[PDB]
Ligand binder design. Sequence first.
Ligand SMILES: Nc1ncnc2c1ncn2[C@@H]1O[C@H](COP(=O)(O)OP(=O)(O)OP(=O)(O)O)[C@@H](O)[C@H]1O
Ligand SMILES: Nc1ncnc2c1ncn2[C@@H]1O[C@H](COP(=O)(O)OP(=O)(O)O)[C@@H](O)[C@H]1O
Ligand SMILES: Nc1ncnc2c1ncn2[C@@H]1O[C@H](COP(=O)(O)OP(=O)(O)O)[C@@H](O)[C@H]1O
Ligand SMILES: [Mg+2]
Ligand SMILES: [Mg+2]
Lengths: 46, 338, 517, 50, 468, 464
Amino acid sequence: EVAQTLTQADQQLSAQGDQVRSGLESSVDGLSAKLASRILGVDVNS
Amino acid sequence: AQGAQQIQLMRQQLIRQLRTGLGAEAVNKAAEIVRAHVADPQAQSATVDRFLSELEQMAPSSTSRLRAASRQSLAALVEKFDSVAGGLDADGLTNLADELASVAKLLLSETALNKHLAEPTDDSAPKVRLLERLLSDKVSATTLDLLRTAVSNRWSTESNLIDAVEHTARLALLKRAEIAGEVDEVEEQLFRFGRVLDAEPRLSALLSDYTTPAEGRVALLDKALTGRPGVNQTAAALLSQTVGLLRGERADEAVIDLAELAVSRRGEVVAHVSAAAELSDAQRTRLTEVLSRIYGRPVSVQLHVDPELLGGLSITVGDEVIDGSIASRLAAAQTGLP
Amino acid sequence: TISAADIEGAIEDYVSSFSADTEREEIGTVIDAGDGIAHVEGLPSVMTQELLEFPGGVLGVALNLDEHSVGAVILGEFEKIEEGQQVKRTGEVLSVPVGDAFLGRVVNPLGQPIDGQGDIAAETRRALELQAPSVVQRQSVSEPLQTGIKAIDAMTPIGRGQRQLIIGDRKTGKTAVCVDTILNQREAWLTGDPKQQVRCVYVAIGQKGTTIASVKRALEEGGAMEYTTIVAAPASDAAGFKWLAPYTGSAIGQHWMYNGKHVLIVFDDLSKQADAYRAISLLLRRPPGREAFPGDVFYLHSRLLERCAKLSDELGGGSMTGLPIIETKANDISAFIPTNVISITDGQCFLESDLFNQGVRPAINVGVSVSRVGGAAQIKAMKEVAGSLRLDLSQYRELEAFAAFASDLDAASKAQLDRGARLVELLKQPQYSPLAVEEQVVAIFLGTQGHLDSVPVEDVQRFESELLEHVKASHSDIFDGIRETKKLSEEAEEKLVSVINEFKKGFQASDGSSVVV
Amino acid sequence: DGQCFLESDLFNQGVRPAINVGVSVSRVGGAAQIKAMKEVAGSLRLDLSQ
Amino acid sequence: TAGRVVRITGPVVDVEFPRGSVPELFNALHAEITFGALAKTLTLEVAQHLGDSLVRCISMQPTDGLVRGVEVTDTGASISVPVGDGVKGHVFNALGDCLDDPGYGKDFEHWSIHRKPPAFSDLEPRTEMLETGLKVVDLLTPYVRGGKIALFGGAGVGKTVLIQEMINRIARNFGGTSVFAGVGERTREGNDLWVELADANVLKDTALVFGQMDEPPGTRMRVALSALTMAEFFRDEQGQDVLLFIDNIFRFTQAGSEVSTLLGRMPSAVGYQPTLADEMGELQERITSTRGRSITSMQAVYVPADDYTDPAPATTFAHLDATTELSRAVFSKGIFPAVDPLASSSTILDPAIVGDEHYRVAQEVIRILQRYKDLQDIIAILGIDELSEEDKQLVNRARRIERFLSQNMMAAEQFTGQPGSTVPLKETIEAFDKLTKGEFDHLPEQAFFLIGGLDDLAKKAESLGAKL
Amino acid sequence: TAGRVVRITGPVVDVEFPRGSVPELFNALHAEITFGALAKTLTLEVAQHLGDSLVRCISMQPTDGLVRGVEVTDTGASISVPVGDGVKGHVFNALGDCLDDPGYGKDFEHWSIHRKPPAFSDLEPRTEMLETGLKVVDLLTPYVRGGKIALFGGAGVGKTVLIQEMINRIARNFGGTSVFAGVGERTREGNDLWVELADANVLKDTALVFGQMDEPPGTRMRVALSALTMAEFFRDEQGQDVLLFIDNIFRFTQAGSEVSTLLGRMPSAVGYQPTLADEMGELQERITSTRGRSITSMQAVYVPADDYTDPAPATTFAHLDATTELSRAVFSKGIFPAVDPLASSSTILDPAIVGDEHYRVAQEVIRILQRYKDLQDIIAILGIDELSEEDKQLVNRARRIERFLSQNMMAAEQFTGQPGSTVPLKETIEAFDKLTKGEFDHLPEQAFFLIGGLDDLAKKAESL
Ligand SMILES: Nc1ncnc2c1ncn2[C@@H]1O[C@H](COP(=O)(O)OP(=O)(O)OP(=O)(O)O)[C@@H](O)[C@H]1O
Ligand SMILES: Nc1ncnc2c1ncn2[C@@H]1O[C@H](COP(=O)(O)OP(=O)(O)O)[C@@H](O)[C@H]1O
Ligand SMILES: Nc1ncnc2c1ncn2[C@@H]1O[C@H](COP(=O)(O)OP(=O)(O)O)[C@@H](O)[C@H]1O
Ligand SMILES: [Mg+2]
Ligand SMILES: [Mg+2]
């Protein structure tokens, strides 16, 4: 039973991770710009 | 319960994998963004200005290979040279430097003579007698007295004696430069030659070897590097002398040591500064002042542009570095992400 | 149901709060490198044993400091080191995170998890070389540390704060004894009382990774991972990690000990650590001595093992019990490292291959095994029942030569022979099956009161087990009394005797005989 | 590819050549013998060791 | 941007490079020997950065004919060997060159032979029996499928014969891939194995990598890594069960010790390199099965001078799931395979895995043999007649048991002319249960020598004048 | 005039001093570790003059956290320990620091721990006997005044009680004092000894000096000299008999070997330091009688591999005057002290020293005990009745003799209310002479348990 649950949960987690990877692709730009501004020391929207 | 723990742990592991991927993508995107930001040279100037302001805010703070006996003896010899050169004329300084270089090369050639002159002994008068019987009248009075002083003191190792003599010669030439009022030019030329030698390993290797005749090596240096039209005469003479008296030290390292000695003659500290682009006069003055404040002693800045810096400055003083490099910031970002 | 909100928030908090303001740094240069040792010029203000950072996130430890350069033991990824690389000083000596979050985790000698279960929340940090408790910061070892092994708990008892060496040839059952001790601590853990709970630290030095995984599986099967931490330095790890792993485990255990907890730490095994330290020293050109070991290997082990102490009441009364393991070659306890560790510890359990092959498992040689703490580490019941065990076994070993001449022997000699045979059978114990102190007391009571005299030797073991089952199912009040009072009362003793007689009425010898009377 | 161990104790006993049969072995075996010899001496070494 | 040879001493070569062109550690460099008789291209593995832009390297080929100051080229990477399904059925050397078909495999994917072991979280204990058909191995030292198995022994005790026997029994009917690593062993043995595998039709499923004892120390150091790299590719990429055979793994350590002192390392105890345990740990930890990816590795471990306390075998012991220790005493008694039943061990020999019956029978056999070993000296001096009757019975039982642990092997025919035999595990357990109970005490001990199961015992006893 | 650290290699530190300020050999130098976690003051001992104003020293404390170039201060003298009556009742380390009260004794008179033995002319040329008052020791293994006594015994044999008894007897009978030197002392055992002596009330008469196991080899090497220096002050300045306990002397030898290895010296046979004999002689020759006062030493000796020909025990036994073996067999019988009368021995059990009557009585006792030991096997297996009548007579006499060697010790009073007894040597000799003749064979065995002389024997006989 533990093996069956582990495989089913692995498949479910892989599908959910694919969905989350698709979803998160929008907000990388803003946080990357924030990181660039922080390291550069000057607040730059670009 | 173990199975539930495993399921939750794999869920957390997948979360961690997503976190790592997102962080890596963010770091790459930020690297591209900053690379674009540094396209404008005004951006590089602004980054350098911000780093200089940070240095201004940064709080202040506070040759070593020679052993005890050799270091003390070299200190005595340099003090004696300082006493001797109280009013020596420039032509006399050049002659003294040439004579000291000749004596150093002689000590190199006469291995038995060097060993007998370098073996430690409490008594000094017989050493003085030997030195006089050797070259009492061949060389001038100042050179004879300096050699007497050199042989008088104790040397931890034989080689150091030769080094001491060479050191004296260099000082003499530098004194001449000081009399000429051109120490800035000689320092600039020496640093330039050291930098080109460092970036040209083949010439450094050929010049560093001591088996080939010294005259040929000096001629090669002249017709290759130091015989060019736009070269300071004093710096060229110093470089030729050191290469002719090389005991095995690497040519680039020897030239860097020569430049360090030249700057230390004024009491300054050499600071090697790497920048993304050449600084401005105001920037140079600001950097010199802030470095002097941080280290107290006056600092001479040897700017060395490198494109991989991307901004800020990377300063090196002694064995201690302040890395304002934007590339360093990018590396920190790329290594600090979970 | 992984929501992107948490990932986005974590990364946003990281980037927004990311500041790398320039700080003045002392930097040297790698002047040479070879087989895990890097010589680095510069770093004039570096401390002895300081941690150094090499490019690519490589870590080294400064051991040799001279005028020319610094010798540094590389803790991993040595192949990444190159002449000319820039080395930074961290300004800190070796230190490890410590906290309750390390329970149930497998970490490397630096405290970094290697079990893949995520980060470990560190309560604080401890330097690996903090001094041991001083002579006036301790109190006499008096609390028993029950290993659940009858041979050890009766013949060479271990008290809390004691250093008991487990020494023997390979495959003699040392790891088994230590794992049995850790498993036995589970009931004390479930009690929930910190005065009884024992936190276990298993330090694996030089073992292959699958062996460490097998040990972890054994601990999980018994529920010991709840209160056990594993510090792992497998055979593939750099010699520096093998050298430092015992100190990391000791630091974690010390953090627990100084907070009033009781800790049991197993070093499996110190011979591998000594070999790794010898490798480091030889690669650093330090003078060798006997067996090529450096002049401070005894200092290595003694400084490691003197941190296991029973703290005074002023310091919280915590304790750390050491169970170092030593692998002898051809049972040569006279070798250099075995001699040192034997001199260092408070008692020894000598395991032998000949005993193991004879069926005596655990293969402890009771004749030479000793515990200097002795009865001070036993409860009153065990002291009473186990008083005669040593002399009885010595007499049995003396008389064994006359096994086939029992008829010629006088009555006393034959009785001693039979009693000794039964006692030797009694001290045998299956693996992964520690016994509670009350059950051990009852079994030793069976052995030493003559209640096994009528039982055939070949059945003794079985008898014992079944008897211990019977009581636990019908007369647990005996076990409860022993556990609560730590002594066997006269009423409890007579009830146990009557129960034993009835069970004997009910028991069957394997040869069809009767064990009554 | 094997060794012929010679012992002084065997030599003095009159066993000449003093080959210690137990610890002496050829790593090629029957491949180095003619068929007749391999047939008549198949298990001679093991027999002598026993 | 090329280096030049500065110092040459045996297999160790010092090479000076320009600034910023020092090769990374373990990088492969190339040098030319132009002397006609010995003309070749030396491959040198960077071992140390000595400072001053100098590097110390181990030559993979003999340095005879090498000249100071010759150009040294840096390939920028470690020694790499071909990987893929194409290596099966071919013979390679430590450098990946195909011996039986020069130029073959040059277009395959190439993997560096230096690699980190699997992550600890990927490791999984293996507790599945691998039945062999050999009585002693199946009973007292059960092998583990996907586990690490070793055959320990001194020179000429039967390590190679047993390796060939296990190739016959395990690899012949193996679904997956086999990798054989000849490490510092006899070239004649390598040729014999090559021909035997070709005739048995197992060669098509086997990759052979030979670095022989005539090679310089560097080749003997790196051939094991090359073969292990091929096996690792099969495990991690192709995802199929792998059989790995190494003979002799001790040669890796021996070559390391041979070059250690020339590399400037102060010797450790017994003349070994200070880094013995660390190098052996790296190599052995690479040889393992991960979760879901199985490598059954069998290694022949030479024990120097029959001394099992020697640091090399002593350090190797920690890396094995199962060890079959061959004894010179057993060999000299004419018992084959010369397995020491009291010294050998297996991690899966417990009641949980092998069952109560197997464990009990094995423990009884070990106990009887231990008692017999204890009584041997008394028997030698005072004779058997001075033992108690029970001890006489035990001595007879032990002699019969020790003879019955011997077996005629498939690979041993060439030495005895007797065809080999295989015994099922159930038959072995039943036979040794009967023996430990004295059910065959009436048969002569010679009836138990070099046979298979109980049918062979009955036939031999009948031939000897007794009835089973 | 201050030096600076140049090289650090574990406990080995190289220090460079100005040209004319090099410290003498064995001088104590002070350095500072300022790192917060490991902050401390290192005491270095100048071991070698390397030349060019460099010296090589052994750090007494771990060098972790030490930085190159830190100032090193020369104290101008070797390691010096406090001396005087103030050191009694306190615990010190090899450097003289008080462990139970830091700073205590820092103002006392301080004596360098490196001192020469008494001048050859000041040595007593005639050996003397140290009348302890214990029957077994006085009769069978008399202790040499100003001599050396090896002590052998496992755990649970009464060794600690024996040490307490000797402390009591030297303090009370001889009006002396005791210095305990724990060389390679286990911290647990050191604390246990401290508390035990405090409980027994003998701590006031004892000065404890601990060189612990977890300290670098230098302190373990020098702790014995420190304790010996305290004892030497007590002998020479206070005119007191001193009893010095060393435990374990083999650990002193092994610490010397470790130090020699650390300094790069080539090991001698079996890996010991080349100067093993010289170091052992320097330590042991300071333990002698001089000017009427003496230091008597009882030293625990470890024999590697049980090999008495091993260089360490071989060198140690060149200085030992007596051997006392404590046996668990004797202890189990209840005989206290549990001294094995047959394994123990003394080099002054010679008629020329102890007298003819003493030697005769001791030899008779030894013969009876040896015959009893021989008959023990027959008794155990064949049964007592199997023996002849003369064998039974000798068994009874030997049992009475062996039980009479037991004594009620002063240290035992803390366990049983009964106090201790001191049997004069003449009384012991005559009592054992009578016993060997069989003049008390009719008395019950228990009458010979834990008593003093003949008066106690008669008193207990009437009680039964
Ligand atoms: N009490 C026991 N009863 C039966 N078998 C036991 C017992 N203790 C250990 N064993 C078995 O003995 C063998 C050796 O045990 P273990 O691995 O604990 O020994 P070791 O001395 O630590 O070994 P190594 O040299 O591999 O580290 C294993 O098969 C273990 O299952
Ligand atoms: N099962 C066996 N039966 C008969 N002879 C054997 C057997 N095993 C080994 N031998 C003999 O012992 C020799 C050594 O075997 P081998 O394994 O090749 O050497 P090593 O043990 O050194 O690897 C063989 O050449 C063979 O003659
Ligand atoms: N003369 C005696 N009278 C009563 N009890 C004693 C006597 N001698 C020893 N003992 C007991 O025996 C034990 C011996 O322990 P200890 O004195 O530490 O010596 P060891 O270190 O040999 O065990 C003590 O706990 C003590 O109670
Ligand atoms: Mg183990
Ligand atoms: Mg072979």
